[PDB]
Structure 1
């Protein structure tokens, strides 16, 4: 069995290997990459996402989200307070202001210590989930707006044609902006490209051990667990590495830098934080190996998780027994 310790693997494809996206994902899996839940892909030196980032300041963040924490430093939830619209140029200036800028630090490890010590005492503002793309249309390799769609994959594997679309999303971050512990909708893959700016630190639980994280989360967030049998779908709960180690939960960590891709694999729980002003692009995708995970994915039916139009068909076809209850949670 490849990668039996479930370590995060780092790949360096050549320009030739970068041509065929599906083939490269299957390659990485042949080497055991999925066992970690997360992999890093460093593009060949010849590749670029676009020519420059000099002209992005007029992109609108219609609903910036202020991430307000409650709890203790290593075990907290966050809620998202909506703020007034602002442009990327306005947000960048805000991120660089004395109130929000990255503090002085020695290295990534020191910054990670500071994040876990101090996150809860601040409320950073995140531009998340903005439909759009920063890939040049002429970038032919690993262009996250030109991937094969999940609807087409389900149709190819299962024969059923379904409605829905699959487009990328932009994320504009600042120091301490936080992504809570989650798997993807329908336990899909994700791919994330850090276009510019400061790093993003990731934490991940191997898919084979995801239920250990879920059981800890039910212990640590007992009211939320009574409210919903899949409350991590709400994407609000944070647990620090120190707390995970105290409770014996298997996990790994890695820092993504600008110019790097990360892939999350089906049922790989992940969480993390941004180091400073940055912009990332991410999208979900599927492969044949996903289908079995999609059929078994948990679902939130309490009303909180509320998701895209396109998840309807995935539930309806892969999880017909759950469909009626889930759809009630959508309405």
Structure 2
């Protein structure tokens, strides 16, 4: 068994190795990368996502989300309050303002301490889930807008043609903007490229221990748990590394910097925060190894969790028994 401690692995593909996405994901897994639930990939020195980021101020964030916290410092829920549209130029200026800017800090460790101590007392604004891409059309390797689709993977493995098209999303962040504990829709993989700006810190639980996190979550958020058997799908629940330690939940942490890829693996619970103004791009993907996770994925049928048009087909084909109840749920 490779990577039995489930450590987060960091990869440095050569230009040649960076030419076949599926092959390299399979290679990473042959080294046990998936057992951590998250891997970092540093692209070849000669590679670039696009020429410059000089002309991105005019992107619209149609619905910025103010992330409002309830609970205690290390155990809280966050709800998203919709705000008026703003351009990325306006957003960046807001992120850099005295009210929202990254505070003085010694290092990543000091900033993490400040995040968990102080996060709940501020309400940062997140420009999340914006359909689009910042990869140059001519970028041929690891272009998140040119990956093979989940629908084609499911067709290749199961011999069934289905509707749907999955495309990338942009995320414009500032200090304290947060992603709550979750696995991907249908326990898919995700790939995240940090285009520019300040770092993003990640926490992850190994897939083999995901049910331990779920059990702790039910204990820590009893109301939410009664409401929905898969409430973590709502992406509202935060639990600090201190609280995870106290409860013996195995986990790992790593900081992603601009120019680096992170891949999350099937059923790898993850959460994190942004250090300051930044922009990331992400998309879900699948491999043959995902199919069995897709079949076993928990579903929110309470109506809260956002269902994409594409997920109908995944549930319909992989989870026919669950399909009706899930459908009437939302």
What SS class does the counterpart of residue 309 from structure 1 fall into? Answer: coil
TM-score, scaled relative to structure 1: 1.00
Distance 2:77 2:291 in 1: 31
The Cα offsets for residues 61-84 of structure 1, whole Å up to 9 and x where unpaired, read as 000000000000000000000000
The Cα offsets for residues 182-233 of structure 1, whole Å up to 9 and x where unpaired, read as 0000000000000000000000000000000000000000000000000000
Distance 2:8 2:326 in 1: 33
The Cα offsets for residues 110-143 of structure 1, whole Å up to 9 and x where unpaired, read as 0000000000000000000000000000000000
Distance 2:135 2:233 in 1: 29
Q: In the comparison of the two structures, how many residue pairs are matched?
A: 330
CA shift, 1:307, in A, is: 1.4
- Show structure 1 runs of 4+ deviating over 6 A: none
TM-score, scaled relative to structure 2: 1.00
Alignment match, 1:285: 285
The Cα offsets for residues 254-287 of structure 1, whole Å up to 9 and x where unpaired, read as 0000000000000000000000000000000000
Distance 1:66 1:217 in 2: 23
CA shift, 1:247, in A, is: 0.1
What SS class does the counterpart of residue 17 from structure 2 fall into? Answer: coil
The Cα offsets for residues 69-105 of structure 1, whole Å up to 9 and x where unpaired, read as 0000000000000000000000000000000000000
- Is structure 2 residue 62 aligned with structure 1 residue 79? no
What SS class does the counterpart of residue 57 from structure 1 fall into? Answer: coil
The Cα offsets for residues 11-43 of structure 1, whole Å up to 9 and x where unpaired, read as 000000000000000000000000000000000
Alignment match, 1:27: 27
What SS class does the counterpart of residue 202 from structure 1 fall into? Answer: strand
Distance 1:166 1:147 in 2: 10
CA shift, 1:306, in A, is: 2.2
Distance 1:170 1:220 in 2: 31
What SS class does the counterpart of residue 203 from structure 1 fall into? Answer: strand
Alignment match, 1:50: 50
Alignment match, 1:91: 91
Q: Which runs of 5+ in 1 are unaligned?
A: none
Equivalent residues in 2 for 1:114-125 (5 A)? 114-125=114-125
Distance 1:132 1:228 in 2: 31
Distance 2:228 2:279 in 1: 32
The Cα offsets for residues 283-320 of structure 1, whole Å up to 9 and x where unpaired, read as 00000000000000000000000210000000000000
Alignment match, 1:316: 316
Q: Which runs of 5+ in 2 are unaligned?
A: none
Distance 2:327 2:46 in 1: 46
Distance 1:246 1:258 in 2: 32
- Is structure 2 residue 236 aligned with structure 1 residue 236? yes
CA shift, 1:329, in A, is: 1.2
What SS class does the counterpart of residue 289 from structure 1 fall into? Answer: helix
Distance 1:256 1:295 in 2: 30
Distance 2:261 2:28 in 1: 13
Distance 1:150 1:229 in 2: 26
Distance 2:286 2:329 in 1: 24
Distance 1:126 1:251 in 2: 25
CA shift, 1:164, in A, is: 0.2
What SS class does the counterpart of residue 63 from structure 1 fall into? Answer: coil
The Cα offsets for residues 160-190 of structure 1, whole Å up to 9 and x where unpaired, read as 0000001000000000000000000000000
Deviating more after overlay: 300-309 vs 142-151? 300-309
Alignment match, 1:213: 213
